[PDB]
């Protein structure tokens, strides 16, 4: 309770850490870059030991009544033909921004600044100093790193060699924009040159949320600039017809517009000092792993829990946080790098492969004594 700790960003990890330190006697504070919390995603999948934690923090009913109505889907050709539809325990589909209000509905105790960015960060072992971008100057006893892959508390309190950024060799983009189809619950993706469009409708039957994945090696110069991001959607799906390019001008207007390259974080440890990462920061398994959205609740969990039996001791409940998530990670991680090798029913082998992942941890309670 007494120690003075910074969550940054509002992920799921992020409120989800917080959450679980403003239960166990801790009072954290939770800031943000963009003016408010990014609900703009496409739907995750919360599963495993994942859908455990759910329950405990009371927002499993929430989810449920958030989770992806969608009836059907049916996978058209360039030219609209339909050459495939609809076909092929406890777990739910839900939008991830349904996902974060509901987490942001539960940390509203906790303190949440947006528009707040850290431009320098130090340390030694009194404390840990924060600049920020307005000016302001702090210093907390501890700082959590909810950044996510491009994190940049990672690259500034780590060096190159401590830590490698995999490329998957895929990115993948998402975004609302109004139906002009006018489909209610319906899905339509195709396939192409190892490309893929996805526009759906769903309980707001006005808008139907768009997406693009495709299969690429090439590199961003920053991947922070979305005009690059979104220059390099046309650039790519120049030439691929079908409703594409009636996609793409509908796109300026999308407030909710995310694009990224599928990749995934590898590092030795996760917590240097008085600062820990969480989330996709350190461990993140990317998209094609699908696990991403619950390793943020295991480690979220485990984070906050190590803290407290530490008794004050960070040192050790960082390195009981590091060695207890590493043989989860690893075993989902490479999950990930396996359906990146890819892209009949005989091919719900995989469906087994993530039970296996998704569970493949056990939680110490802490809640228990
Ligand atoms: C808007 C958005 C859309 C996504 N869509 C998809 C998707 O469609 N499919 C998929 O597979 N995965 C997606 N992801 C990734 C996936 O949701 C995460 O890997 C997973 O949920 C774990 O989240 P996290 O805890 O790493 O926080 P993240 O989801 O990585 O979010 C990080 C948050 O921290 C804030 N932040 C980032 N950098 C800074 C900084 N320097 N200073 C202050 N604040 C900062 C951002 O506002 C952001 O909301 C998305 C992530 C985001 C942020």
Redesign the pocket.
């Given at each position: 309770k007494n120690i003075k700790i910074l969550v940054?960003?509002?992920?799921?990890?992020?409120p989800?850490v917080c959450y679980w330190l403003r239960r166990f006697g801790f009072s954290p504070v939770l800031?943000?870059?963009?003016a408010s919390?990014?609900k703009?995603?496409?739907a995750?999948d919360v599963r495993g030991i994942a859908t455990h934690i759910a329950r405990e923090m009371g927002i499993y009913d929430q989810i449920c009544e958030m989770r992806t109505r969608i009836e059907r889907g049916r996978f058209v050709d360039s030219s609209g033909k339909v050459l495939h539809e609809e076909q092929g325990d406890d777990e739910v589909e839900i939008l991830?921004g349904d996902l974060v209000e509901i987490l942001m509905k539960t940390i509203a105790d906790v303190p949440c600044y947006f528009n707040?960015?850290?431009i320098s960060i130090e340390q030694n072992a009194d404390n840990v100093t924060v600049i920020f971008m307005d000016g302001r100057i702090e210093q907390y006893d501890l700082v959590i790193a909810?950044?996510?892959?491009?994190?940049?508390?990672r690259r500034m309190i780590f060096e190159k060699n401590e830590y490698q950024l995999i490329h998957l060799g895929a990115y993948?983009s998402?975004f609302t924009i109004p139906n002009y189809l006018g489909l209610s619950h319906i899905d339509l993706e195709c396939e192409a040159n190892n490309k893929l469009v996805s526009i759906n409708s769903d309980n707001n039957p006005e808008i139907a949320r768009a997406?693009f994945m495709f299969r690429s090696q090439h590199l961003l110069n920053d991947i922070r600039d979305e005009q690059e991001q979104k220059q390099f959607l046309r650039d790519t799906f120049r030439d691929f017809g079908w409703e594409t390019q009636n996609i793409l001008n509908r796109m300026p207007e999308s407030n909710?517009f995310?694009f990224?390259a599928i990749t995934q974080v590898k590092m030795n440890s996760w917590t240097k000092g008085r600062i820990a990462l969480?989330?996709?920061?350190g461990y993140?398994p990317?998209?094609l792993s699908?696990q991403?959205?619950n390793?943020?609740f295991v480690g979220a969990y485990i984070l906050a829990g190590e803290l407290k039996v530490a008794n004050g001791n960070y040192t050790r409940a960082f390195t009981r946080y590091n060695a207890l998530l590493r043989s989860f990670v690893d075993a989902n991680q490479k999950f990930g790098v396996w359906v990146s090798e890819s892209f009949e029913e005989r091919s719900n082998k995989i469906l087994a492969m993530i039970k296996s992942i998704s569970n493949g941890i056990t939680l110490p309670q802490y809640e228990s004594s």
């Open positions: 940054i960003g509002a992920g799921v990890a992020g989800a800031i943000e870059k963009y919390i990014r703009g995603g496409q995750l991830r707040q960015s850290i909810a950044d996510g892959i491009h994190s940049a508390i993948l998402t997406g909710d995310y990224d969480v989330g996709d920061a993140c990317s998209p699908g991403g959205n390793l943020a």
